[PDB]
């Protein structure tokens, strides 16, 4: 289970974060051992559609080739803290698994600027017992983490050396599909 109440960035700029552009995961930290594969790749687009906060997700397993997309409408708990009911979709937005109660993740933006972010997520999916996941994001694919986000990791009392890099994995990202999904 998840154990952290992540604190959102003071003065979080929602319009800047939810601007329709893509965020690449470059490093991640799962608090529960063996909760995720050690080699993995993910990206998301966050935006607004008709005034609703939306996220489109992309997961790619560089070994198995398992690939999946999701779309969510986000509900606001407080500035920078959201609850998201996801539907699994193909890259075109065609629904493969409908929204269902108990299938949701929380999402907290702990730090963000024009190029980088640190987020916490807690995934709830059916009978899965998942744990806390932190991710360092960048606007640029596979970019090395800058001093601002690394300092934010420290300020959150996390050790960045413990994070697992995704930058060296053979991963491709369909950024065009992610952006287009924001309306799905």
Instruction: Indicate whether 133 belongs to the interface with ligand NO2 (CB under 6 A).
Output: yes
The CB-of-81 to ligand NO2 minimum distance in angstroms stands at: 16
Residue 95 to residue 87: CA distance in whole angstroms: 7
Interatomic CA distance for residues 26 and 125, integer angstroms: 24
Q: Please say which residue, 97 or 146, places its beta carbon nearer to ligand NO2.
A: 97
Q: Does residue 46 touch ligand NO2 according to CB under 6 A?
A: no
The CA distance from 139 to 24, in Å, is 6
> Of 2, 8, 22, 25, which lies in the binding site for ligand HEM, with binding defined by CB under 6 A?
25
Q: Which does 62 bind (CB under 5 to 8 A by kind): ligand NO2, ligand HEM, none?
A: none
| Site for ligand HEM, residues 116 to 145, rule: CB under 6 A | 121, 123, 125, 135
Rule CB under 6 A: is residue 72 a binding residue for ligand NO2? no
Query: Which string of x and - marks every residue 33-62 that binds ligand HEM (by CB under 6 A)?
Result: ---xx--x-x-x------------x-x---
Q: Which of 112, 130, 119 is nearest to 27 (CA)?
A: 119
Residue by residue, DSSP assigns 38-78 as SS-EEEEEEEEETTEEEEEEEEE-TTT--EEEEEEEEEEEE
Is there a contact between 131 and 3 (Cβ–Cβ < 8 Å)? Answer: yes
Q: How far is the CB of 122 from ligand NO2 (least distance, A)?
A: 8
Nearer to ligand NO2, 17 or 105 (CB): 105
CA dist., res. 79 & res. 15, Å (int): 11
Enclosing H/E stretch for 134: strand 133-138
Q: Consult the annotation and say whether 59 binds a ligand.
A: yes
DSSP code, position 32: S
111 in helix, strand or coil? strand
Residues in contact with ligand NO2, shown as a per-residue x/- string from 96 to 125 under the rule CB under 6 A: -------------------------x-x--
Task: Supply the Cα-derived Rg of the chain in whole angstroms.
Answer: 15
- Residue ranges for the known binding site are 59
Site residues for ligand NO2 per CB under 6 A: 36, 121, 123, 133
């Amino acid at each position: 289970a998840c154990t952290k109440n992540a604190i959102a960035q003071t003065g979080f700029n929602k319009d800047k974060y939810f601007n329709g552009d893509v965020w690449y995961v470059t490093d991640y930290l799962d608090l529960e051992p063996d909760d995720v594969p050690k080699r993995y790749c993910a990206a998301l687009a966050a935006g607004t559609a008709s005034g609703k906060l939306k996220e489109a997700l992309y997961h790619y397993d560089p070994k198995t080739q398992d690939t999946f997309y999701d779309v969510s409408e986000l509900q606001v708990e407080s500035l920078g803290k959201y609850t998201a009911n996801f539907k699994k979709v193909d890259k075109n937005g065609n629904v493969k698994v409908a929204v269902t109660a108990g299938n949701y993740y929380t999402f907290t933006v702990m730090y963000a600027d024009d190029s980088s972010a640190l987020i916490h997520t807690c995934l709830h999916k059916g009978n899965k017992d998942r744990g806390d996941l932190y991710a360092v994001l960048n606007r640029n694919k596979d970019a090395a983490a800058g001093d601002k986000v690394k300092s934010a990791v420290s300020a959150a009392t996390l050790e960045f050396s413990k994070f697992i890099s995704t930058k060296e994995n053979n991963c491709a990202y369909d950024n065009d599909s992610l952006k287009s999904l924001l309306t799905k």
